[PDB]
């Protein structure tokens, strides 16, 4: 009946949980407890990216030279992209 | 009897009949039989490198994501990322 005061009512509810659990994680002794923030979450996860993709692109141009070392030619280089597909 | 003399002297027959084959082919009808400059290959080999390594990296931000779509602590975090190296 009164769905829309409802719902809100879930967020009160889910909101003191959601703080009383981040008093209690900050209660611990480990710093690494802490909640992190939306924006040292993304920090995080772009320096995590920024890892990985130029791990990714290290082995990426060393594996397409090794097949590129072979080819002189125009219609050898096609066949050595479709070899790469 | 093999000498270094031996190795150097087919390395020199290699390299003299290699630069006339490419003479020759600079000289054919089609241009795409041509054989492609030493910069004309590294532009189309990183070419296909950054083209690999920026697909690479949609996958590998993408799939870092749905990670960290998990994690809310500094000690979850590392956690996620101990698998996935």
Redesign the interface.
């Known amino acids: 009946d009164l769905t829309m005061e409802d719902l809100t009512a879930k967020i009160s509810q889910l909101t003191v949980e959601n703080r009383e659990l981040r008093k209690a994680?900050g209660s611990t002794a480990?710093?690494?407890?802490?909640?992190?923030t939306a924006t040292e979450?993304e920090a995080?996860?772009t320096a995590?990216?920024g890892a990985?993709?130029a791990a990714?692109?290290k082995k990426?141009?060393a594996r397409?030279?090794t097949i590129?070392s072979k080819?002189?030619?125009?219609?050898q280089?096609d066949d050595a992209?479709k070899g790469?597909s």
């Open positions: 994680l480990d710093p690494r407890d802490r909640p992190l979450k995080q996860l995590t990216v990985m993709s990714a692109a990426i141009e397409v030279r590129f080819v002189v030619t125009q219609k280089v992209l790469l």
